[PDB]
Design a protein around this ligand. Structure first.
Ligand SMILES: O=C([O-])C(=O)[O-]
Ligand SMILES: O=C([O-])C(=O)[O-]
Ligand SMILES: [Mn+2]
Ligand SMILES: [Mn+2]
Lengths: 302, 303
């Protein structure tokens, strides 16, 4: 169950990946197969409907593989579809965790500055972009752009005061995020927001995998490649605060709403961590891979 | 000229204050005066429309001073209407400036930290609440809940890399914000977001005054009272980083969009400024007054 927001012939649509290299237009499929119109037009609204939307989508895929002659209405080959971020316009800023991998904390010069409590900041929705999109280099405000491959969690059911025991029941699914950061701007304003919120600096996608397809988030692996070179490799089992601990902490006095996006922190290997620091430049290709979500690819603009 | 989001008969509506005793339901007013329905149902959508919305609103105001068979179908007493926050659901987190009054920086930490560049963080949209609404104490999370009266600026026109010269051209207007903060969580999580983003901890309002009505905001003045006792009195000319400088800084690598809210920093006098520390408790009544916007009033709730 992989969901996406695709664009094809001037139509933005909520899509479900069929068998890899095909994508189903859920609204159009519902009208032709189920004769009805009940699927909303954005993925964040579908997430609000929770499990019943997901099951509705599976039934639609099942009926579509059954013989019929309407497939041309709603079956698109992925090669012909531009994938936006699964949630192109979040309702709120992306919630981000800092220094959630021990090695990355050390990398930024700490081992004393390993947080004992989640360090949490946000990225403005104006940073959100999709698979294959060009990230503005922002040469004018910074010469220290950095990449951050991260696993992202999307809340699928609202709640406050959520226990770590109930946390996964408030999760819709998982996607990839590149937390692109201006390291100089990060120091300048002392709060991470401005250096984390430059335009286009949050690639997200390529798809949003429902949690029912990832039973063990602990085993996911994040791999970041810059110009083909492996530079990050981290296991979600090694992050200091687990996803249920993060949800319990984030929601202690704050309501998490369906569609909220949580970036759980990048592993070691970021560009600033190299002696002879490696910063991003125009033309750098960035590939982040988390199976079974896929690979999120972006280029820094030239 | 003051816009608001009111509620009457289980319907939220964009409203215009008339003579500070009445509020005009712009949608219903357009309906029985021109028999068209073009005015959007949210203030942030109206802000996105540009000066044509403000002009249409002026026109509806005038056409109604005109004799009325059913003025009451779109004109209401403010006494009978509940005011929500002017923007009840921001499209993004509220942008907040830290340490913008020199005497507030000194009362929270020393001089050594005052910023040479704006220190900027945010409050989650779930923080927004309205004039007269009850603010949750969140006692099972914090006991260091503090008050911050601030002037808020609302962006009326999308822009990136706005020069300080063109900044006011991108402003819709002004409102009051209470940046209620949990001081301990602020320290615990080291980044301000968690301590600043507890449910109901950003009262906003009571109205949004269009910039045309407030040409000189250097002369605005923020007064905060807790249970009747005056505790904050700042002048907007005392800000490090004026409104135009803030807009130029924020928008330089980042698009500011219509409806975006910028809290410009609280002045001296917060509860943590007190040596035996003050801290809000249940039943505390906080009033923040900025004229011409009005007074924003909220009460801390029970545990
Ligand atoms: O600070 C961050 O953004 C992180 O740790 O991923
Ligand atoms: O830091 C703050 O929130 C302020 O000074 O207004
Ligand atoms: Mn990050
Ligand atoms: Mn503040």
């Amino acid at each position: 169950m992989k969901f996406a927001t695709g664009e094809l012939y001037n139509r933005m649509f909520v899509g479900l990946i069929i068998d890899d290299e095909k994508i189903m237009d859920l609204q159009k499929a519902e009208k032709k197969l189920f004769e009805l119109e009940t699927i909303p037009g954005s993925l964040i609204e579908c997430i609000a409907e929770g499990d019943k939307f997901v099951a509705h989508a599976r039934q639609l895929a099942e009926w579509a593989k059954k013989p019929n002659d309407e497939l041309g209405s709603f079956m698109y080959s992925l090669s012909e579809v531009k994938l936006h971020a699964p949630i192109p316009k979040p309702s709120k800023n992306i919630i981000c965790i800092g220094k959630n991998y021990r090695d990355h904390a050390i990398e930024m010069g700490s081992e004393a500055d390993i947080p004992e409590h989640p360090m949490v900041f946000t990225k403005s929705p104006v940073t959100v972009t999709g698979h294959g999109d060009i990230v503005k280099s922002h040469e004018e405000v910074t010469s220290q752009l950095d990449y951050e491959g991260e696993l992202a969690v999307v809340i699928g059911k609202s709640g406050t005061r959520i226990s770590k025991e109930d946390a996964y029941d408030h999760v819709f699914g998982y996607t990839i995020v590149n937390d692109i950061t201006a390291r100089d701007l990060q120091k300048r304003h002392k709060q991470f927001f401005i250096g984390k919120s430059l335009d286009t600096t949050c690639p997200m996608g390529p798809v949003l995998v429902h949690k029912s397809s990832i039973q063990e988030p602990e085993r996911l692996k994040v791999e970041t490649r810059v110009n083909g070179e492996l530079r990050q490799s981290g296991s979600a089992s090694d992050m200091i605060f687990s996803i249920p601990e993060l949800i319990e902490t984030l929601s202690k006095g704050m309501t998490l709403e369906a569609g909220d996006i949580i970036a759980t922190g990048t592993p070691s290997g970021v560009g600033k961590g190299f002696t002879p620091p490696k910063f991003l430049r125009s033309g750098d290709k960035i590939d982040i891979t988390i199976d079974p979500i896929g690979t999120l690819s972006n280029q820094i603009g030239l």
